[PDB]
Design a protein around this ligand. Structure first.
Ligand code: MG
Ligand code: MG
Ligand code: MG
Ligand code: MG
Ligand code: MG
Ligand code: MG
Ligand code: MG
Ligand code: MG
Ligand code: MG
Ligand code: MG
Ligand code: MG
Ligand code: MG
Ligand code: MG
Ligand code: MG
Ligand code: MG
Ligand code: MG
Ligand code: MG
Ligand code: MG
Ligand code: MG
Ligand code: MG
Ligand code: ZN
Lengths: 69, 106
RNA sequence: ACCCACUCGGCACCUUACGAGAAAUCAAAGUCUUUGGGUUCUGGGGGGAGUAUGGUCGCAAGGCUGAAACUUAAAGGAAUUGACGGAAGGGCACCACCAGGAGUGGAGCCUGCGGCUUAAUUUGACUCAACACGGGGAAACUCACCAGGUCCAGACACAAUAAGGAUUGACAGAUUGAGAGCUCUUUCUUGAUUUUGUGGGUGGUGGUGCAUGGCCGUUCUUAGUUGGUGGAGUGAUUUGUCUGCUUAAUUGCGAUAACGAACGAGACCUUAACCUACUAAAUAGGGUUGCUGGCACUUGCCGGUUGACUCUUCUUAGAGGGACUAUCGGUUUCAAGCCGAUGGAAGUUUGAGGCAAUAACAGGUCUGUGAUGCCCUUAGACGUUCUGGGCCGCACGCGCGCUACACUGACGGAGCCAGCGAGUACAACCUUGGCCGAGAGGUCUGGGUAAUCUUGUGAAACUCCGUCGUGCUGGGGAUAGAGCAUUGUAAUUAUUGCUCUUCAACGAGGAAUUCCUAGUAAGCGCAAGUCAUCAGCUUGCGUUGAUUACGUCCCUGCCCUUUGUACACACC
């Protein structure tokens, strides 16, 4: 068989990068539990849309939300 | 040999066992163990001769076992009761004929 | 001089050995383990070597005499079955040749295989027995190759994270060939499935057919092969299994230390032929007869209708029968058989096949296999899966084929006849009939899971009358150019179908060499096979249908017999 040449690139996948987990919430003056980031209109509170620079995609819907806010 | 003996006991006209493959040493050979009658050619082959081919797997290579049995034509149940070439004639009966006319009457 | 009979001596010879001998053979090579008549000479595995040396005899060449070191597991003898022979005999075969036919090799083209070329142009096979073969007619798939990307289909075992997350998912654009989250921008999801290593595997159109199976091909579809007694040999062996004549045949008649047998051949089975004899039919065909269409017009002729009734010749297919070389005539040990009539559906094994022995081949397949050993490989995989390309490239060799080089034609009409087939409901099969289109094709409708519909597959070659009459001409059709269709996701590297145009090579093919003996050769289509689409290929099938042997070893190959052999890995 032919001599293996290979033209570079030994790529990999997204290994997740585990950040903080519960950073999309705030708890203040004893008992209160206030929400950070807009909750998903497709499926209610628990799943909250990712807020970027006019980019509003989901996780359970995986991608299906794009409208401006 | 044992197989052949068994076949004989079962009352078959002939047995032919071919064992093909590597039976000691790499260079392989088909050994042939036979007894009795056997036919080979013609339509009486599919009538009386029953065949079997099974390949045996061993950790150095494959064997192939080919077994033929020539069933007795007389013990047939359904189909022809002999080989087509076999012609056997019946025996005549004894005669003391002449002894001059006479008539049996009722 | 013969002739007969006897007799001593000689050169030999023939048959038997009851004796010898390893046997070939031997009246001595006998009277030898049942060993002694008298004597002379010579040998003690093969080489080294009739050499070295010393004598001696020779004019000389040489002779007589004659070692050893060292080397070596054999050298040899007689026979055996093979194999082979530029030995001698006898067979057989259109894969031999005659008598002929049809040709290929020449030409243009399809298409195999080289060689070259290439990122790759994937490989397997190279006399018959590789070369339109791998059912190999590749647009991707196939796919084994190449340029690139994607995925885990990394079992299970043991461990590091063990949820403050193991880890799955990811639109928008740059990313990328790319509505591949391939990822890098991201920060939303996912919940212990897993991932990171180490044991361990699994997949591989990876490798080896020289490790194998199975299948096949070939010796060989040739007539060959074997054992039980008996005979001959000390034995391997041999005879049976053969001088002849026969046959397609070790098929027989025969001859005979063999006799009777088995496998193969034959028998068989499938098919193709005949059946006014059965058994049958509105899924076959008829008859009369209803109604009915056209005729002459007398009753008569051709029709359309599953309207009645009946029939089975043709039809299909069940059960039978029938040919056994029958009858006769020749010819031959008056045998087996062969030849000629005659009758017959049938007289080449009645035609054609299917099956097909003993022994084999380092024949071909590990690219048919969840047939497979071992080796390689095993997450930048030789697993895969997408994407494009390649298998199809051309100075060139050869291998099957198609088309043709015309007047036995060509082109136009018109006439107008087949047999094998195949064919869908979960798909998209075969597809009449009606309209649209010069075509190709559309379209609407159908009929058919089929002796029912396609289909009477009204197929070609053909036959009838016409146009050109032998000029690379209206022979011939290659390249081309443009359009219109069709299949498919995709047609440039024309898939293919059609339309107009273009009109190339070739006036029957050298050295060679294939196939063939009767419904055969050859001509001509059709058909299934692959197939979404593509036929110059293939298994069948019909249609048209000859010429010439009815033989022989001259060539070629095979077989046997006799011989020779120092070969038996067998003349490479
Ligand atoms: Mg590489
Ligand atoms: Mg037989
Ligand atoms: Mg036979
Ligand atoms: Mg010696
Ligand atoms: Mg000798
Ligand atoms: Mg041959
Ligand atoms: Mg090819
Ligand atoms: Mg083809
Ligand atoms: Mg495989
Ligand atoms: Mg082999
Ligand atoms: Mg004997
Ligand atoms: Mg013999
Ligand atoms: Mg006669
Ligand atoms: Mg026959
Ligand atoms: Mg080989
Ligand atoms: Mg393999
Ligand atoms: Mg061929
Ligand atoms: Mg029909
Ligand atoms: Mg022209
Ligand atoms: Mg094609
Ligand atoms: Zn969501």
């Amino acid at each position: 068989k032919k001599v293996y040449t290979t033209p570079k690139k030994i790529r990999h996948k997204h290994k997740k990068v585990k950040l903080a987990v519960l950073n999309y919430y705030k708890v203040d003056d004893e008992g209160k539990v206030a929400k950070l980031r807009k909750e998903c209109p497709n499926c209610g509170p628990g799943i909250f849309l990712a807020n970027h620079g006019d980019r509003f995609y989901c996780g359970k819907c995986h991608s299906t939300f794009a409208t401006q806010k | 040999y044992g197989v052949v003996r068994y076949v004989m006991e079962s009352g078959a006209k002939g047995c032919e066992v071919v064992i093909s493959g590597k039976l000691r040493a790499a260079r392989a050979k088909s050994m042939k163990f036979a007894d009795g009658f056997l036919i080979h050619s013609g339509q009486p082959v599919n009538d009386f001769i029953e065949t079997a081919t099974r390949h045996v797997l061993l950790r150095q290579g494959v064997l192939g076992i080919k077994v033929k049995i020539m069933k007795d034509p007389s013990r047939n149940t359904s189909g022809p009761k002999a080989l087509p070439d076999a012609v056997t004639i019946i025996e005549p009966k004894e005669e003391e004929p002449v002894l001059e006319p006479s008539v049996k009457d009722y």
